[model samples]
Target: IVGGTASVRGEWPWQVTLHTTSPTQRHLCGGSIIGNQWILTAAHCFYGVESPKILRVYSGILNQAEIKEDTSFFGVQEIIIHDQYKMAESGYDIALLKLETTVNYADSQRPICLPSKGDRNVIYTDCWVTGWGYRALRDKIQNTLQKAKIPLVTNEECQKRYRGHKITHKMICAGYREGGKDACKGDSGGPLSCKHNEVWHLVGITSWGEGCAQRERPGVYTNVVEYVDWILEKTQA
Candidate 1:
């Protein structure tokens, strides 16, 4: 709808904006558009409502706020929370948001590419994530869209790095060891991206980690590899 330009990669799988209730309601918790219509996000982002009029999804755009001006939000339509999904449970923490309309790619927007089954090694490589989710004091997510580059740490590395905490299989970890850079509060549901062969793949979805961006702890994401089967079915369905 509205227009602005950012030199985002054309191979990027496709990014999305996950708004809370609405200004008339809540705001964005972050989001990713892996397909033409379906946007994968965390169940917490939906707050359990299958259909919410307040929530919004905008894809094929570089600047989310700019899209807000020109975009008309679709429905919360339906939420597919895994039957066993739960915040307390790692594996089931995943959720999907279905949009009523397919994204229309324009000059300011493009989709991120999806990786193959064997390409799950997105972590150990250079991955980037961007979002407009910034927290109030700036310790959390930023409202202005910002991009951060992080390296995928091995599960072994993560385990040793987060010695006191549990780095479950459902969680994918990465970051700049020195810290100072990481996903903040509002960045939830955003994608952790990695590039291969000139294409950007949606490797991870920002899920959880230590508080905001801690100097010692790294940010963790929802491992998208685990849900590829379900993703294919839903997007094509």
Candidate 2:
């Protein structure tokens, strides 16, 4: 998150720390808890990754550098990439992870609500992105979770800005036109949530962008509502 402050305790409860292959658990990407056994993330995060066995999921912790003894880690049973996703062009760029054991819901850990079919007209203003991503463009990653509010952009404007890349219906764009607030490296596959009538909807999954917090270029995310049905089918199976 850009122009962000450290997150408060129990805020963004569905947020997750995606750890990948290393002698130690290395923070790779970010994710969202969708259910007891399922997590939502960006497909490109696994581009060269071959094994899901090497991944680990950590939750309930607001800070990574210092743990409060309440944080929990989970074993990854499998990773499911969107069947049509690709890295060459407009990658579908969405993925899911199935935890080996169901996670227990607590004040600091819970599932985020997904946008329903009837919620199609939901506006994307005043949305927030939370992650332990880099604080700035090409900067070092932050030790604590960071959060910043960003405005949702229209597809037309987003396409006009990031001209060459394909901005499909499967993607949602968010950030400032003046730019300054956005997600950065080590922030892939994170959640971009919109608070709706007291509930936060998992509207987007951090996918791609021109660069972190740049003028004119906003962050692109997987449109969670567009693929809600597909997610249901995969999670049920």
Candidate 3:
């Protein structure tokens, strides 16, 4: 767990590497596995493209030789980028993918639980972050997802800290304004959850930040609650 600490990702293949055969294809960031066939992550992580071929989602046991190796497991069926998501404006920066096949769930490979209607703000109490993104260039491919214990700062405090900034309902403000346990580059589109009701709820998706772990400029996340409508519409329950 990066913030509040959820050890649910037991052996769960950490993160997804999306790319196309074309050299121009962009490498997108995202998280995975909640249900047998569904992956929860940020919508911006899967923007653009009508074809699924160029977009390959690889997950599973990676780095076997203790180097940045791709064990290369799992396949993707389709990508459902949120229709209402505006990458530029930073609107609804979240979404999910319905895996072509189902995953076997266990302690190591289970999906984190999503918050209900009132889960996000239920308890800003404590938070943290976890991911295999570019942290410090260790063992190469982020061998093990690292965790950062972030403090839950109030939205008002967040606004004050970034006074004269562009933070809207689309974004969430957490962690100390002085900088410390915050998410960094390559961690975008990952979970920024808060602990509540005896469980961890997906409150925010590590969206953006200025520099890698800087003071006064904490990490910005996608406010999950604000995008509830868009999520339901895109998922089409």
Candidate 4:
């Protein structure tokens, strides 16, 4: 994430790194552990991915270089992108990855709670975003997970900032109004978590933005609360 700090191990247990399954793996996007075998990410991340086998998920690891540690890597069994997801700015930019095996939950690996339907109208505070995205516009992807505290922006305010673009109800906004912190390249599909009743809820999914930490162009995310029902239906047998 741009203008963020290195996050501590287990601080964001649900955060997972997505990578190509090629001989030389490369980090692609960030995802959230939403279930024992389910991962939540952006549909855009899988645009050119022909098969689920082409993606690998690494969870519970703070540094990408330590992926060889064995306990954090998992294979993808399937990928389910939203049927309505057409483009990044158009909304419905969410996807789910079914893991080959269930994740062993621990202090460093766990599923984040999904917000209830009623959470849609709740004003959330104490929000944060974490990822291994670029730290600056011209910088390379970060190896260590980074995190930053950003305020949630109202739909009206977000629309004002992103004039000419439609900020639908399915999307949520978060960042500084003056723009010094935000999710950037390679951070797509990461979680935008907010604390509610002492528990963290997966409020948003990193999707797109005007630029990295640019003034008035806050980070845009898929509002998780808006798709909670769709998620349950998709994951249920």
Instruction: Indicate which candidate wins on lDDT.
Output: 4
Q: Which one wins by TM-score: 3 or 4?
A: 4
lDDT of 3 at 129: 74
Residue-by-residue lDDT tens digits, candidate 3, 98-143: 6667777654455666666665446667666766565532323354
Question: What digit string (tens of lDDT, one per residue) describes model 2 on residues 137-216?
Answer: 77876788999898898888888887788788778889788889898887888899899898899999888788788989
Candidate 4, poorest ten consecutive residues by summed lDDT: 64-73
TM-score of 2: 0.95
TM-score of every model versus the real structure:
0.81, 0.95, 0.77, 0.97
Cα-lDDT of candidate 2: 0.86
Q: After superposition, how far is residue 26 of candidate 3 from its true place, in Å?
A: 11
Candidate 2 residues lying further than 4 Å off, grouped into runs, are: 67-72
Candidate order by TM-score, highest to lowest? 4, 2, 1, 3
Q: Residue-wise lDDT of candidate 4 within 53-86, one digit each (tens)?
A: 8789998989988876354579999999998989
Residue 23 lDDT in model 4? 60
Candidate 1 vs candidate 3: the lDDT winner is 1
Give me the candidate number with maximum TM-score. Answer: 4
Where does candidate 1 have its weakest 10-residue lDDT segment? 1-10
lDDT of each: 0.63, 0.86, 0.59, 0.91
Residue 147, model 1: lDDT of 73
